[PDB]
Structure 1
Amino acid sequence: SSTHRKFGGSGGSPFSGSGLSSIAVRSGSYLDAIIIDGVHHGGSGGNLSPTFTFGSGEYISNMTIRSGDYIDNISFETNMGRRFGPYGGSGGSANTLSNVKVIQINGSAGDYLDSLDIYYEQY
């Protein structure tokens, strides 16, 4: 079994992540875009982060999202102890997925990343 949780506001066009082989973001004050398996969701503002490429057997085990009307910030840790971020600003409020396995990242995006809808197993 698994579950999901949504973060952020009501704007943007919905998207579905197509896998969890790599993640990058564009960010400034907010998350301008999330780039999942090379596929860009969001706008062209901000600056491009390095790409995080998951190794064999590697998955997101902890993730913190700051959000308000948009996604402000993302950070994550993997089951191999590697970290991504934080990227973004210090606005919004923080919520965390703790001791999980992320299986799919969906969301909604326009000029910014408005929302994330994270599907995961809770351990």
Structure 2
Amino acid sequence: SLTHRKFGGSGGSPFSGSGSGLSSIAVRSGSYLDAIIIDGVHHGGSGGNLSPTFTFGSGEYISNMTIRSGDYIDNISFETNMGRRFGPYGGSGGSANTLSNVKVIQINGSAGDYLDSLDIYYEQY
């Protein structure tokens, strides 16, 4: 069943993922998530360090995700259905929330200098 969940604060300007799906993800992070790079498109600032890009294989998707957040996105980590891991990247602030047994289909959000928020569209199993 398809649903969505917002994480983080109220600031920044809105962005969207590609629209249908999600082919690759990288982040910039320090103490917080500075940026999320979705399908090669940058959303957020130029601070922090750039992660390697995670590129989803055929039949591969985000299945479990842990996000630390307060007013911003502090940390992102995920696992896929193929057992691959991304992160954790970011700091230790905020509070943790986990999507468990999902299939993420799109990531939208809001950003300025940092990644303020994410709105994750996923199938909840």
TM-score by length of 2: 0.96
1:6 aligned partner: 6
Match of 2:94 among 92, 95, 99: 92
Q: CA deviation at 1:19?
A: 3.2
- Percent of aligned pairs sharing the same letter: 99
Offset, 1:17: 5.8
> 1:21/1:43 Cα in 2 relative to 1: closer, same or farther (>3 Å)?
same
1:19 and 1:45 map into 2 onto residues whose CA distance is: 27
Measured against aligned partners, the alpha-carbon deviations of 1:41-68 in whole angstroms (never above 9, x if no partner) come to 0000000001000000100000010000
Structure 1 residue ranges, 4+ long, deviating more than 4 angstroms after superposition: none
Contact 1:18–1:36 (CA<8 Å) still a contact in 2? Answer: no
Q: Which runs of 5+ in 2 are unaligned?
A: none
User: Which stretch shifts more, 103-112 or 8-17?
Assistant: 8-17
* Equivalent pairs, count: 123
Instruction: Find the aligned partners of 2:61 and 2:99 in 1 and give their Cα distance.
Output: 13
What TM-score does the superposition give when structure 1 sets the normalisation length?
0.97
- 1:18: Cα distance to partner? 6.2
2:118 is paired with a residue whose SS is strand
Evaluate the alpha carbon distance shift between residue 7 and residue 119 of structure 1 in structure 2; reply closer, same or farther with a 3 A threshold: same
Relative to structure 1, the CA distance from residue 35 to residue 112 in structure 2 (aligned partners, 3 Å threshold; closer, same or farther) is same
**Relative to structure 1, is the Cα distance of residues 110 and 14 closer, same or farther in structure 2, using a 3 angstrom cutoff?**
same
Moved more, 13-22 or 109-118: 13-22
Q: Is the 8 A contact 1:19 1:36 kept in 2?
A: no
Deviation at 1:114, TM superposition (A): 0.1
Q: Name the CA shift for 1:50/1:18 in 2 (closer, same or farther; >3 Å).
A: farther
Question: Comparing 70-79 with 12-21, which one deviates more in the overlay?
Answer: 12-21
* Cα distance in 1, alignment partners of residues 101 and 56 from structure 2: 17
Unpaired stretches in structure 1, ≥5 consecutive residues: none
- For the Cα contact (< 8 Å) 1:62–1:77, is it kept in 2? yes
- In 1, the alpha carbon distance for the partners of 2:25 and 2:7 equals 18
Give the CA RMSD over aligned residues.
1.1
Out of 51, 54, 57, the position equivalent to 2:53 is 51
Question: What's the secondary structure of 2:86's corresponding residue?
Answer: strand
